[PDB]
């Protein structure tokens, strides 16, 4: 049985990592009903968008949502993890970020307080994540210049 | 139209709405949305993961 | 299948249709399914009158 959207937000990181598809779905099934415009097709043409800037304003909100999706898919793309929800990398874990052991992290902490504890070094980790790939780019570069 | 046993049946030039004029030229066209996602069995499995 | 329809002229008319497109071969007669004094008969000619 599945706890529902964001159900494991108070669960251990391992339990939420088991239901990450659940959190992944609310990125799409909020935006499937709005792009549908099936219940919007007939109601006063296109919900009277003439002299109603809330209609455009509403539309701009829909744009922000798909724009955020594109930000996350871009990050998964430049880290070579586009197709997968869980991917391992080559970046070693610098201990200065967090000193907690594996058992304490995955069976004693929630993703919220973890993201709060590591929000300080997120940019650095992303930099290593954008950098580390670059050594794969370079190995492919060796295969390119023969 | 009038059930008079085929006696009455008179056709007058109505002054119908303009949408009927659009229907007169849109009779051949139709709008559809593409659902490009199909799933089918071919008895092949991705055993290996990653 | 087409990306865009053919050129449709927005001819404002009420009794007779003007400057439209002609059905090929025989003329065409269009009513709804019920056909009993309730709809509006649409006629598309094969030869245009001037």
């Amino acid at each position, epitope marked *: 049985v599945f706890l529902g959207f964001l159900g494991a937000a108070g669960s251990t990181m391992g339990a939420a990592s088991m239901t990450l598809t659940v959190q992944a779905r609310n990125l799409l099934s909020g935006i499937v009903q709005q792009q549908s415009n099936l219940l919007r097709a*007939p109601e006063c043409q296109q919900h009277l968008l003439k002299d109603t800037h809330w209609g455009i304003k509403q539309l701009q909100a829909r744009v922000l949502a798909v724009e955020h999706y594109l930000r996350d898919q871009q990050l998964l793309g430049i880290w070579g993890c586009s197709g997968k929800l869980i991917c391992c990398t080559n970046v070693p874990w610098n201990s200065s970020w967090s000193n907690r052991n594996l058992s304490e992290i995955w069976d004693n902490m929630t993703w919220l307080q973890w993201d709060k504890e590591i929000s300080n070094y997120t940019q650095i980790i992303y930099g290593l994540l954008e950098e580390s790939q670059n050594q794969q780019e370079k190995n492919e570069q060796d295969l390119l210049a023969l | 139209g*009038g*059930s008079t046993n085929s006696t009455t049946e008179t056709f007058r030039p*109505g002054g119908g*709405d303009m*949408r009927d004029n659009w229907r007169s030229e849109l009779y051949k066209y139709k709008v559809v949305k593409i659902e490009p996602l199909g799933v089918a069995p071919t008895r092949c499995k991705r055993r290996v993961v990653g | 299948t087409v990306q865009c329809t053919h050129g449709i002229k927005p001819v404002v008319s009420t009794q007779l249709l003007l400057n439209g497109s002609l059905a090929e071969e025989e003329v065409i007669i269009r009513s709804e399914n*019920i056909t009993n004094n309730a709809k509006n008969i649409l006629v598309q000619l094969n030869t245009p009158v001037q």
Partner: antibody
Amino acid sequence: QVQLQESGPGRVKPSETLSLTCAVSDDSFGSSYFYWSWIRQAPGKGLEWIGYIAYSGGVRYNPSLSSRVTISRNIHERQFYLRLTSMTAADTAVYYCARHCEDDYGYYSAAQSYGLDSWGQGIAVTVSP
Amino acid sequence: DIQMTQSPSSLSASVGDRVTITCRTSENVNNCLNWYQQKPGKAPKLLIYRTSTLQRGVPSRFSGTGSGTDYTLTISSLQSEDFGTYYCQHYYGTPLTFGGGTMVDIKR
């Protein structure tokens, strides 16, 4: 809509012409796919649909009184009228104006009423010299 | 043209009874029929403007069924403000017809 004000002469002599007026308040007139009908009811007997005028223009009346009935529609005046020539004592009845919307598309913001949901107050027209 | 008939012509029922009224049409109307209530003296108030679709301001104790040439209005639990004369009307093209009517008073 809810205010269909009727007016006219409740007293008509024989062989004359009966003209009646039905004014609409809620401006549902300008909305398309609306049919505005005139209906009379003889006492004790049933109700008889006289004629209807469409959103484009008055198409049909009742075949019995087809040549002696003319329904007009003054767009901007917000009203629509009925005319009945050669008034006889058999036409002495109670007259109403009623509205109903039929949509071939079923394609609107809300659901419409196929039946006659809007009715006037009724005019009692009597005929005698 | 199309003619309509109601059964019974005069009916006298009690409060709370499941009452039915039959409206027979001469020709197939394709689910196009309306039921109306008229207290004597007032304009006919609309009840059901399709085969089964109820209008608003109307309590839930009313219902209409049927197809083809036979249609039935039904009241599960009658009330006090349900007297008067009831009519049926088809809107299947021009011209429009009305039923004879069903005088419904309270039983005695």
